[PDB]
Amino acid sequence: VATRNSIAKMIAGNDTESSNTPVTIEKIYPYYVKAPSDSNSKPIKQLLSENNFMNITIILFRDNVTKSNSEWWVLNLTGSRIFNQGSQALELVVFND
Numbered sequence: 001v002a003t004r005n006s007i008a009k010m011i012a013g014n015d016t017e018s019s020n021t022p023v024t025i026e027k028i029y030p031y032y033v034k035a036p037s038d039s040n041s042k043p044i045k046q047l048l049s050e051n052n053f054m055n056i057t058i059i060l061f062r063d064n065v066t067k068s069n070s071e072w073w074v075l076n077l078t079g080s081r082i083f084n085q086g087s088q089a090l091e092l093v094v095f096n097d
């Protein structure tokens with residue numbers, strides 16, 4: 001309920017005080033996914049179980065320097081940094097078959 005309330009306040013941003021903070025959700029985004037030769041791909045729970053703390057941050061970016069209402073979303077995976085740190089980005093480890 002807290003995450004839903006926060007994202008509601010953000011998408012209906014009318015305060016210019018809040019909505020500048022990325023809202024975090026837990027237990028969402030796996031890291032290690034195997035892509036077999038078939039159609040089905042499998043998120044490996046052996047190498048990393050999805051029952052642990054997995055952070056995913058969100059925030060709605062917008063601006064008027066474009067002189068228009070052209071907004072978009074942006075995600076972030078800053079906790080548990082991997083090589084090529086590059087804050088405010090995502091990374092997926094895939095096991096090809």
Ligand SMILES: *[C@@H]1O[C@H](CO)[C@@H](O)[C@H](O)[C@H]1NC(C)=O
Binds near residue numbers: 012014015
């Ligand atoms: C923003 O919209 C919500 C929708 O009800 C309202 O509760 C809130 O008071 C509004 N805030 C401002 C600053 O307009």
